[PDB]
Design brief:
The PDB classes it as immune system. The complex is a heterodimer. By secondary structure, chain A is mainly β. Chain A contains no helices and eleven strands. In chain A, strands 2, 4, 5, 6, 9, 10 and 11 form a seven-stranded mixed beta sheet that branches. Chain A is globular. The chains are: A mainly beta, B mainly beta. Chains A and B meet through β5, β9 and β10 of A and β4, β8 and β9 of B. The complex binds rocuronium.
């Protein structure tokens, strides 16, 4: 069955970087877009960015363009998200998810990871 | 950015309910498609997809769920509400960058 397995909870100091993983199984990783979402209490869901693993094409919500870096390793079917310059506002659950559709068009996140909890504290 | 507005809070089991999502702008794209999605986030779980392109039920989703809309008003209809439908319902648009979500509407059964 389709599965997106995300890495475990992180507790980090302000100004550090984190790199979290999203390992895909049960479908062809290079045929679908992956995107990342941020969920904090009081702020519902926010879109961070998408990547098309086959091509490495990535694009961002302007407000995360400074902060988030998306990559994909085709050989391990793993997507990564790196966050630099962590602040207390980065304390959130982060999801990865696959999009229904193809390469030239997609419609919605159809299979979701379980979320990675990042907590930023001094 | 496109703003999607939902009430924070929405019932007895078996009743019908609907969730409203109001867009600041038309979500119709030049291809005639409306890039509006509905997700359910059950308590302590990841979001799950219900509806895409405003009115297409995703594979494996109960036909109790249906989506409609017109102009800037969108509706998720739920027939015969069940315990498994409890959670937060989010709308989302993919017609313009950045992609944006509604604030979520919480559904509880009494
Ligand atoms: C329906 C409209 C909404 N948007 C469009 C914008 C669309 C993109 C425009 C640029 C394209 C370049 C190239 O041809 C393709 N690349 C695939 C990756 O490898 C490199 C080649 C497809 C490409 C990235 C498109 C994919 C689908 C894109 C995101 C569409 O969005 C969706 C959800 O389908 C427009 C504004 C917001 C996004």
């Amino acid at each position: 069955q389709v599965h997106l397995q995300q890495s475990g909870a992180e507790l980090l100091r302000p100004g550090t970087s984190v790199k979290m993983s999203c390992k895909a199984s049960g479908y062809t990783f290079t045929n679908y877009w992956i995107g990342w979402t941020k969920q904090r209490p009081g702020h519902g869901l926010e879109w961070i960015g998408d990547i098309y693993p086959r091509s490495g094409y990535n694009n961002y919500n302007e407000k995360f363009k400074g902060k988030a870096t998306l990559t994909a390793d085709k050989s391990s079917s793993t997507a990564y998200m790196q966050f630099s310059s962590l602040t207390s506002e980065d304390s959130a659950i982060y999801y990865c998810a696959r999009y229904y559709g193809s390469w030239s068009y997609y419609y919605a996140m159809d299979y979701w990871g379980q979320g990675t909890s990042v907590t930023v504290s001094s | 950015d496109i703003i999607l507005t939902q009430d924070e809070l929405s019932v007895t089991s078996g009743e019908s309910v609907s969730i409203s999502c109001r867009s600041s702008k038309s979500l119709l794209y030049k291809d005639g498609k409306t890039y509006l999605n509905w997700f359910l986030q059950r308590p302590g779980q990841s979001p799950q997809l219900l509806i895409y392109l405003m009115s297409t039920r995703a594979s494996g989703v109960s036909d109790r769920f249906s989506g409609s809309g017109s102009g800037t008003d969108f509706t998720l209809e739920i027939s015969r509400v069940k315990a498994e439908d409890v959670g937060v319902y989010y709308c989302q648009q993919l017609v313009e960058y950045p992609y944006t979500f509604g604030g979520g509407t919480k559904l509880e059964i009494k």
